[PDB]
């Protein structure tokens, strides 16, 4: 039953009540309730698929059996020193965290480890959908094979921004696959590229 001073959000819930009335007495006079219960259930479905936890001073981000540990130091009110440790994912993620830990830029670190796990789950369920949908077999996350042909799946970074884009390679030919993924789309194209060539 706590009345929150948020004070941006309260200036917003008022504004567009007022900005649509610029079209010619719309003010709230009432403040929202706060209940930690729902607030948590929301922060849950935003992390969904991954847990955040804290053993001071470090704060762990974990999707099963993977741990990205961020130890952070703050001299009020500003961050100073950030440091990081991973497992098994050092290489795949390396380039973006070169940047992150090098600027001591925190959210770039996190949001990139989040979206890497998401591009990894996307590829893994993309490769499942391909293997059972045709004659293909699997080696690791990276690769699938049909006879003499090897198609790799994995992410690259445009170094500034934490959002990875996907890169589907193969032993040559490249021009051909790349275009059958664009026109016919990543699954139906990589199915088609396992017929012609």
């Amino acid at each position: 039953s706590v009345q929150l001073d948020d004070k941006l959000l309260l200036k917003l819930l008022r504004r567009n009540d007022n900005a649509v009335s610029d079209s010619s007495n719309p003010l709230p006079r009432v403040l929202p309730s706060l209940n930690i219960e729902q607030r948590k259930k929301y922060l849950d479905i935003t992390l969904n698929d991954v847990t955040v936890t804290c053993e001071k001073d470090m704060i762990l981000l974990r999707k099963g059996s993977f741990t990205a540990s961020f130890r952070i130091a703050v001299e009020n009110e500003s961050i100073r020193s950030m440091a990081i440790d991973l497992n098994a994912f050092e290489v795949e993620l390396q380039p973006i965290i070169q940047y992150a830990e090098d600027t001591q830029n925190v959210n770039v670190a996190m949001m990139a480890v989040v979206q890497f796990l998401r591009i990894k789950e996307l590829h893994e369920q993309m490769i499942s959908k391909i293997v059972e949908a045709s004659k293909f077999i699997r080696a690791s996350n990276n690769t699938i094979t049909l006879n003499d042909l090897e198609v790799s799946f994995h992410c690259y970074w445009n170094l500034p921004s934490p959002y990875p884009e996907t890169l589907i390679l193969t032993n040559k030919v490249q021009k051909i696959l790349d275009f059958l993924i664009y026109q016919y789309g990543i699954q139906l194209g990589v199915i088609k590229y396992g017929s012609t060539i």
Binding site: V2, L4, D5, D6, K7, L8, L9, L12, L13, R15, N16, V30, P32, S33, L34, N35, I36, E37, Q38, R39, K40, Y42, L43, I45, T46, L47, N48, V52, T53, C54, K56, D57, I59, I72, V74, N76, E77, S78, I79, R80, T103, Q104, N105, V106, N107, V108, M110, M111, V114, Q115, N158, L159, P160, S161, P162, Y163
Partner: protein, 211 residues
């Protein structure tokens, strides 16, 4: 109960009855300020007869190291399509195409926690191409290159157009999203192909090479 702050200021994350199932309201706000760091967040606006769903979009600025104020996009529980969300009040820059992203994802038909996470991540992404791209020009202030100082003169809202001085000569530039490519350059006023290549690698490493 006011240990919760609107901005995600760094102190809340550190030092030292069940609330949320957690230990105490402090140890909840340590967890909440932790998660929120990712820059994207889901949080409830709760009223007695309704609950809106807000979307926290927060950038980390490295000049003074702190986050910029949270941006909110807010979603109303719908009517006439009964159990789904619809768009309500947004303060976001006018460069972010907010509505084209809503349709690209939900098609207005299915609004699902799964699909709404995909919705922010699209907005937030367009927000960091712009911010990260402006900020790269702020970070160079005071830095030399070729032992000539760089000061910045002017940059526009979203930073396609820029003017800096490099040690006594004025370079102007124009950029094209989302290539972050430099399409035009004016060196001391005359046309220049040298710096042209790209917004990052080429505007340090290629500034030394020819000019």
């Amino acid at each position: 109960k006011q240990f919760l702050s609107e901005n995600i200021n760094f102190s809340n994350l550190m030092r030292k009855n069940e609330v949320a199932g957690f230990k105490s309201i402090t140890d909840f706000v340590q967890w909440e300020n932790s998660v929120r760091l990712i820059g994207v967040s889901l949080f409830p606006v709760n009223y007695d007869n309704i609950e809106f769903m807000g979307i926290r979009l927060e950038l980390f600025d490295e000049l003074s190291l702190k986050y910029d104020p949270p941006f909110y996009v807010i979603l109303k529980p719908s009517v006439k399509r009964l159990g789904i969300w619809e768009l309500f009040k947004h303060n976001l820059p006018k460069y972010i195409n907010i509505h084209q992203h809503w349709q690209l994802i939900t098609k207005d038909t299915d609004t699902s926690d799964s699909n709404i996470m995909k919705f922010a991540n699209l907005c937030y992404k367009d927000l960091l191409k712009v911010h990260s791209r402006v900020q790269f020009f702020r970070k160079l202030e005071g830095n030399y290159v070729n032992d000539k100082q760089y000061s910045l003169l002017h940059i526009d809202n979203m930073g396609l157009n820029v003017s800096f001085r490099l040690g006594a000569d004025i370079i102007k530039i124009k950029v094209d999203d989302g290539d972050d490519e430099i399409i035009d350059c004016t060196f001391n006023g005359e046309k220049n192909i040298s710096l042209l290549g790209s917004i990052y690698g080429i505007t340090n490493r290629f500034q030394s090479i020819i000019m």
